[PDB]
Amino acid sequence: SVKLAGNSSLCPVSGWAIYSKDNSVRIGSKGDVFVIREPFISCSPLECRTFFLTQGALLNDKHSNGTIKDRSPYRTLMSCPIGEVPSPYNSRFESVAWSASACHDGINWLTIGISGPDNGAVAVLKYNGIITDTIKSWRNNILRTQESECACVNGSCFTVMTDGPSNGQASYKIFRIEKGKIVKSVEMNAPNYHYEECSCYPDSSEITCVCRDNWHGSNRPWVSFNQNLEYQIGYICSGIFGDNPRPNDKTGSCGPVSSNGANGVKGFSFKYGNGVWIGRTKSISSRNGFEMIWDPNGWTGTDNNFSIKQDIVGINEWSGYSGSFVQHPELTGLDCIRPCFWVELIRGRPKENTIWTSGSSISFCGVNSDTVGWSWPDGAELPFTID
Amino acid sequence: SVKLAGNSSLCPVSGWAIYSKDNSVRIGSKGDVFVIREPFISCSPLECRTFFLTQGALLNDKHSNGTIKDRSPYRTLMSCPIGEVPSPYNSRFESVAWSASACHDGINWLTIGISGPDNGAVAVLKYNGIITDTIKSWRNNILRTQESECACVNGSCFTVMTDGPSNGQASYKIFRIEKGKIVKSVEMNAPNYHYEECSCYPDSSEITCVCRDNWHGSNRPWVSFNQNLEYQIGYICSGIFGDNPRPNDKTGSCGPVSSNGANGVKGFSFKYGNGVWIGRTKSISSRNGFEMIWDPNGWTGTDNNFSIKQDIVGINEWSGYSGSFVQHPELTGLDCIRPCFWVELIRGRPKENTIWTSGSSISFCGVNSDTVGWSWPDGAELPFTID
Amino acid sequence: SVKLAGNSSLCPVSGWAIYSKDNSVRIGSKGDVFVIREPFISCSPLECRTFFLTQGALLNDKHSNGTIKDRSPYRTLMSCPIGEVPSPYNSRFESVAWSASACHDGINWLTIGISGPDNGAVAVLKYNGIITDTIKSWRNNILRTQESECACVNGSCFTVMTDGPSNGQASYKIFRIEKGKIVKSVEMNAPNYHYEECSCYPDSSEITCVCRDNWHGSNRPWVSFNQNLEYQIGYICSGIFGDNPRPNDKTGSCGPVSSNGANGVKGFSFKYGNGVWIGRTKSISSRNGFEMIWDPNGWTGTDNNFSIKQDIVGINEWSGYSGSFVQHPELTGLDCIRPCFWVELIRGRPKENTIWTSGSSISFCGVNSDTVGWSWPDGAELPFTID
Amino acid sequence: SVKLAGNSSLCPVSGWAIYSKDNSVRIGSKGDVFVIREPFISCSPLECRTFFLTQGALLNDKHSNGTIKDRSPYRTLMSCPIGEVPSPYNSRFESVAWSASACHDGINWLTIGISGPDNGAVAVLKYNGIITDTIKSWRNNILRTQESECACVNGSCFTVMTDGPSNGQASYKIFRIEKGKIVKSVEMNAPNYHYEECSCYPDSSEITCVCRDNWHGSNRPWVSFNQNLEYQIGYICSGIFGDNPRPNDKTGSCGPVSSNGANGVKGFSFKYGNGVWIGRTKSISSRNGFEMIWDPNGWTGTDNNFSIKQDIVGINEWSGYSGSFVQHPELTGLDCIRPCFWVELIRGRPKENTIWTSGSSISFCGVNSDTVGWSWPDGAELPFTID
Ligand SMILES: *[C@@H]1O[C@H](CO[C@@H]2O[C@@H](C)[C@@H](O)[C@@H](O)[C@@H]2O)[C@@H](O[C@@H]2O[C@H](CO)[C@@H](O[C@@H]3O[C@H](CO[C@H]4O[C@H](CO)[C@@H](O)[C@H](O)[C@@H]4O)[C@@H](O)[C@H](O[C@H]4O[C@H](CO)[C@@H](O)[C@H](O)[C@@H]4O)[C@@H]3O)[C@H](O)[C@H]2NC(C)=O)[C@H](O)[C@H]1NC(C)=O
Ligand SMILES: *[C@@H]1O[C@H](CO[C@@H]2O[C@@H](C)[C@@H](O)[C@@H](O)[C@@H]2O)[C@@H](O[C@@H]2O[C@H](CO)[C@@H](O)[C@H](O)[C@H]2NC(C)=O)[C@H](O)[C@H]1NC(C)=O
Ligand SMILES: *[C@@H]1O[C@H](CO[C@@H]2O[C@@H](C)[C@@H](O)[C@@H](O)[C@@H]2O)[C@@H](O[C@@H]2O[C@H](CO)[C@@H](O)[C@H](O)[C@H]2NC(C)=O)[C@H](O)[C@H]1NC(C)=O
Ligand SMILES: *[C@@H]1O[C@H](CO[C@@H]2O[C@@H](C)[C@@H](O)[C@@H](O)[C@@H]2O)[C@@H](O[C@@H]2O[C@H](CO)[C@@H](O)[C@H](O)[C@H]2NC(C)=O)[C@H](O)[C@H]1NC(C)=O
């Protein structure tokens, strides 16, 4: 076992080749499949795994009755191998959690699981499944984190947590974690910014997070930092707006775009110099569709011009959360950090006439060989027997 | 593989971080999940496992129809990974057993399984799954043991068994076991004392057991011993009474508290000099709620004053048996033995309108970082389809 | 990996300690559990496994509808860990088979699966799951074998196969197999003898098999042989008759006992000098109950006197097939070959009002420490939903 | 780990020994079993696996309802151990795919998964589950491949893909792949020939493919080539016609036989100098029955005489696709490449009154010891509950 270096740059890519699909909701009509939300992929030097929050209920069972917002004591962070349905019969237990992150430093898995009350929530940090630290709410207002993988460089792993309002100024903290112990934390000085559900990746020994502004930004806010947590902050300038909901594309802003700014969806983007790969919904008002767009000046430019769009999910199909994951050279044998992404395909409430809400997943890795746009939707026929 | 040393002291702890929750009963509404009682957790130097008794029946099937106590020939000791539901598909067979203990010496698993008739029961010991010894009832009155982990120091493992009345003076024996072979046993001189279902842990090369007085004590009895089985006996002195049922808290006794003394519940406590961490129900009459209390003079002092209370399950929620487990420095990399505990959340008979009784579980580990009290209950909606 | 030596003698034992119980039929009321017949245990130097024939059907499903004695093209030899229910989700595929054997030489599993037509059946031999030989019917009349483990000594494994009538003189052959290749076979000159479903074990570098006389013997026939297949033949002399059906106990014979001699059940016995451990049914007429009996002169003496009887299943409870298995020193660390046995607990047709027949199992290992008689029966409540 | 050499000849075989049967459809009447098509077997130096396509539906659930051809975005390539039913609980995820191949080079698995639209489909190649290359449709007319194992020689793996009409002249390409990277391809000059669903095996450092002419041949086309993709082409000359449908056996052609030539079924054959082992349906008009025929001059000779016929499935039983797999000396210890085959037994829509179509499988390995003909059919009783 060797620590992931994290020192090479992101692989430049021309397109997205499909990596996995689990069909969880179709299979869970009869099989023993967890009700899940907030899946996310993360890889070691040896395998990739799907992390997810269950409510400890199976599809098509009465205990699946529940909403998109549910911070219950039943919620657990579990994992299974990529592209398998999340079943009690193939799922590793990670942590008790209604908000989570995980990443592998090259030696062992770090998991971060937040549970307890809204006014006093506690992150439990595990390294190789052993409790190595805790951090408690510092604003008593729903301590919460990424719902996607943390990022590791030379034996240190990094994440972002928020505490405070989801509809106003909140507090945002960045963490350095070694062997599951918090060795440093900084509060981000970010007045008029809002950071939720960050997607964070390593690139040339430094961390870039693209997050959700739930307050008043229909473009995505970003924070980047070195191993000492010295940070820079901004918003993606492109008039190709990243969030959902959002206005139609037009001139963008390097600060928060207020038009359709309130509310949002977890997402991601990859910075390449002044350019940006944006994953976003195809609807401006609803979690429907998904597409990747290459905007060669979209990190720092405000025009709504782009070079590449690749269809992932069709406009009339359910999408949901999306997030980054990487494959390090230690896993791939490449000379660069390969960017990948997942999409959560949400079914049930509140858009559909069911008692339950659950997600399946699809994922894609960046390549420079030939790719094709299509639609890989969830595919389940709702409602189910239990409804 | 190395023998666990067992020679460091218990880690000092200020509170309890949530470690696992399996949601067994909620998931067994649809999936193939054992009807279980007496889960307990025990760790090798590489992983932690939930040990449990089943009667060879699944939830929501007619064979779940049961009686509250039953030493049946169908009962088996099985184990699955911590936090996972106990299923026929993920569970390892250990022993034919209606009473049990297990613990890892650092080299292999010891399992103790008692089966056979009430007038002549036999404990089958296995080391690495191979039978290495038997011991038969010496009073012909339900030979029985811990229903939690045995304790290991330098290649020896230690347990307590009882044979005799559950409602009067019984016989209590301590055992030293090496590679699954009983090498020494001593009968306790304990007139007017009653020891049931001990929770035993190692601390500085000695074992401390906190147990259940089912005859006439609402405080918990204890027995501590060295590797040569030289022992000391007592009752927890604290006015914070530990058993269920019990009176409201008042002046304690260093002998058995006769008030509400009959009957009881399997529990645990951790000694720190004159102090004690007590785990107990929140209800004085029934197996409802759970709380951890730090009483800094409660091992040896009789007042009802305490310094810390941490909510685990709310008073209106089902609880059940509890017990100690530890994480040895060989697993954690710490310089001390880490105290942890599990709670069984019992659903069904006799309190609810079902044909069956079954438990899910929660566990916590002692830490010195920030923690919080909450309620993590079972969550199942009873009755079930089969009822 | 080292070849099992097979050169020590059987461990002398005073009694039988319970080792496993799977409760398959109780669990298969709801769980995904194969319909099975002909289970048997066999061990490597690292684990013990249950081998069994499925008919490619699950309990409580319409495909379980059976004849109750059928050599179908659906029948497969599979295995799972001892004490686990045989499910599609935990079972290794071994071979296509309506009659089978398996044993581990210390390096790899040998499996023997017989399939095809009654007039031309073929045994497929596999070593490490690779086909290494075949042998075809030489009498064109149901080629068939042990339904229990073969026996291994110093890199050679040995079995017995029958071809010919089950109600008359037939042909009986012994086989030496190395790395799954038949290196030698001998036909047993055995006029007026009948050998079916042999239980064969190693002892001091030689093989002893105790079998079923289905023609005209209510005592069990035996054949012992060295590594060059030079054999001796006989019948167990004890007036403690071993087969089912059988007459009441009385003066035995060193040849076949014709009284109630037709038909039989698969069984076993362990030879100790002039003495014998007999496992048998408790009923003389029906596959009900099971007991172990120590007859210190029963191998070679014809009286009906014995020293020890140990109850295993009550007389009013269904039993069935039983067979030997051993644990070699390479698995146990002992200086002798440990004798163990299994019992198949048959449920359904023809004795019960179901469309199906399926068995669960129990197993026991010989010890010289204290043991106890009891009843460990199947425990299922028939009929099932499908009936 | 060592590269498979692939330089020895095919083992000489006199007949076929049954290797596996999974009973998938029978078991899926109650258990959680994928709806599957296009099963195929492929082996590493350590084990053999069943690869299969599913549509992300289980048997006896409503999502099993579908069409009989369909390149959906729900279809995934998955693998389980050979002879086990393909379940969500025992199946590894490989790739998003409605057409596929896989093979092990001795170091890692290669997997080829084609997904995307009919006018621009993309093959995603993975080595050890990591994307290593893609290739896009070059005729925009359903890029498709083998649906059986690719073939490996000295660290290079070889496959065939087709792009173009299924009912007229198409384009056929051969690929050389190293560590999941295409290092060379050639387009075959094959006017008036048609290649579909190739069954490709290594023999003496060269690859031979026997395929399906869906255009105008009832005899099978073949293509052989060296590591430099220098190729030769031809049809099997035998008047024992290999495709389904086909005419009654008569004088063959070394070119395509137009009588009954349109349409076809995936199959295989093994070349031995001028001779051929032919696997075919027993019916000339439908996918019913299966038989193995040795025709000692059938590769190059046009007579309808043969030396050996071995029954596999009876004429009144459902069969389906078949393909080749091999066991290299590195797995078996032999000095030659062992030829095996699998048959899909397809059940359901449209010949039967079900909403679904799904298969079980059987496989055999070539031996020179005694074998026997029989029928090992699917055995499921349709229709099912969901129908
Ligand atoms: C097996 O699959 C069969 C084929 O079904 C297709 O594939 C499946 C897997 C699905 O993708 C399915 O949607 C595909 O059609 C399936 O046959 C199908 O059966 C369904 C359900 O019975 C039919 O759907 C219903 O159609 C009627 C009639 O629609 C026409 O007429 C009305 C006027 O009366 C118009 O308003 C429509 O525009 C159509 O022109 C509808 O009345 C009905 O609506 C009800 O449910 C919807 C949900 O959207 C509600 O919102 C409404 O209020 C109604 O309550 C359904 O849409 C479908 O036509 C049919 N397809 C075909 C091709 O025949 C078969 O049942 C399946 N077998 C089994 C055992 O499951
Ligand atoms: C506590 O015990 C450790 C470890 O002791 C060793 O391992 C045990 C399983 C057992 O077999 C012991 O007898 C072994 O000695 C002690 O560390 C050892 O101390 C000795 C003497 O100082 C030294 O030679 C070894 O190098 C040490 N072994 C290791 C692995 O560090 C430790 O000193 C004891 N701590 C106390 C008494 O608190
Ligand atoms: C019983 O056999 C053991 C082991 O024999 C070895 O293992 C066999 C499978 C086979 O490979 C033989 O060739 C081996 O000799 C005997 O112990 C061995 O004895 C030999 C001869 O003295 C000695 O040189 C080896 O090193 C021994 N190996 C071991 C591990 O002890 C033993 O003598 C035999 N009989 C008894 C009852 O002990
Ligand atoms: C068949 O191949 C074997 C093995 O060849 C080696 O491994 C292959 C995977 C490939 O990487 C080759 O380059 C390797 O040579 C041949 O055996 C080897 O032959 C060489 C040359 O004679 C010799 O030095 C090695 O000792 C051999 N290795 C072994 C394991 O025998 C073999 O000669 C080849 N030819 C035939 C027809 O069998």
Ligand SMILES: CCC(CC)O[C@@H]1C=C(C(=O)O)C[C@H](n2cc(CO)nn2)[C@H]1NC(C)=O
């Ligand atoms: C703005 C981010 C954050 C602000 C509190 O809100 C999130 C918004 C959601 C959405 O926009 O869909 C649903 C999320 N979520 C997670 C769970 C249970 O684990 N239930 N809701 C929710 N997070 C939390 C921890 O509540």
Ligand SMILES: CCC(CC)O[C@@H]1C=C(C(=O)O)C[C@H](n2cc(CO)nn2)[C@H]1NC(C)=O
């Ligand atoms: C006071 C200890 C003891 C005296 C015999 O009584 C226990 C109390 C129980 C309770 O207070 O709930 C239920 C337990 N239990 C276990 C099983 C079978 O595993 N059925 N009942 C029981 N144990 C035994 C061996 O019977």
Ligand SMILES: CCC(CC)O[C@@H]1C=C(C(=O)O)C[C@H](n2cc(CO)nn2)[C@H]1NC(C)=O
């Ligand atoms: C006398 C032995 C032998 C003579 C043929 O008969 C056995 C007797 C049985 C009984 O006494 O119960 C049941 C067995 N059995 C095995 C299977 C499964 O393949 N179905 N029945 C049967 N074996 C065979 C291969 O048919």
Ligand SMILES: CCC(CC)O[C@@H]1C=C(C(=O)O)C[C@H](n2cc(CO)nn2)[C@H]1NC(C)=O
């Ligand atoms: C002639 C080859 C080929 C030309 C396109 O046609 C195949 C023929 C089939 C048959 O003859 O049975 C059924 C196959 N198949 C597979 C799936 C699902 O992935 N749906 N159809 C089909 N393959 C493809 C990729 O469509």
Ligand SMILES: *[C@@H]1O[C@H](CO[C@@H]2O[C@@H](C)[C@@H](O)[C@@H](O)[C@@H]2O)[C@@H](O)[C@H](O)[C@H]1NC(C)=O
């Ligand atoms: C990238 O880093 C390489 C590996 O560095 C070594 O491994 C890491 C995990 C640390 O332990 C570090 O102290 C070691 O030096 C370098 O060897 C290499 O020079 C670096 N740069 C590039 C782009 O290759």
Ligand SMILES: *[C@@H]1O[C@H](CO[C@@H]2O[C@@H](C)[C@@H](O)[C@@H](O)[C@@H]2O)[C@@H](O)[C@H](O)[C@H]1NC(C)=O
């Ligand atoms: C639940 O169980 C009651 C008793 O069952 C009986 O005792 C058990 C141990 C078995 O021996 C069984 O065969 C006996 O019938 C029943 O009286 C009761 O009706 C059952 N309850 C339900 C709701 O099924």
Ligand SMILES: *[C@@H]1O[C@H](CO)[C@@H](O)[C@H](O)[C@H]1NC(C)=O
């Ligand atoms: C399901 O959810 C609703 C909340 O919208 C809750 O009030 C209701 O009681 C729940 N139903 C059941 C059966 O638990």
Ligand SMILES: *[C@@H]1O[C@H](CO)[C@@H](O)[C@H](O)[C@H]1NC(C)=O
């Ligand atoms: C990475 O971490 C190691 C161990 O702390 C440190 O000594 C080393 O200098 C670091 N390397 C780089 C490139 O920062």
Ligand SMILES: *[C@@H]1O[C@H](CO)[C@@H](O)[C@H](O)[C@H]1NC(C)=O
């Ligand atoms: C621990 O066990 C070993 C082996 O029996 C023994 O020699 C040693 O003295 C023990 N160590 C201590 C400190 O007790």
Ligand SMILES: *[C@@H]1O[C@H](CO)[C@@H](O)[C@H](O)[C@H]1NC(C)=O
């Ligand atoms: C069992 O199988 C037989 C033979 O096919 C059939 O006649 C009978 O109906 C079946 N019984 C049931 C209940 O399915």
Ligand SMILES: *[C@@H]1O[C@H](CO)[C@@H](O)[C@H](O)[C@H]1NC(C)=O
């Ligand atoms: C065991 O087997 C080997 C042959 O493989 C032989 O050389 C040796 O003599 C045998 N050992 C004994 C009989 O101890």
Ligand SMILES: *[C@@H]1O[C@H](CO)[C@@H](O)[C@H](O)[C@H]1NC(C)=O
């Ligand atoms: C096999 O591959 C190796 C590695 O590239 C090459 O050097 C070698 O010559 C090849 N061997 C043969 C027999 O073709």
Ligand SMILES: [Ca+2]
């Ligand atoms: Ca927003």
Ligand SMILES: [Ca+2]
């Ligand atoms: Ca732009």
Ligand SMILES: [Ca+2]
């Ligand atoms: Ca009490």
Ligand SMILES: [Ca+2]
């Ligand atoms: Ca006090």
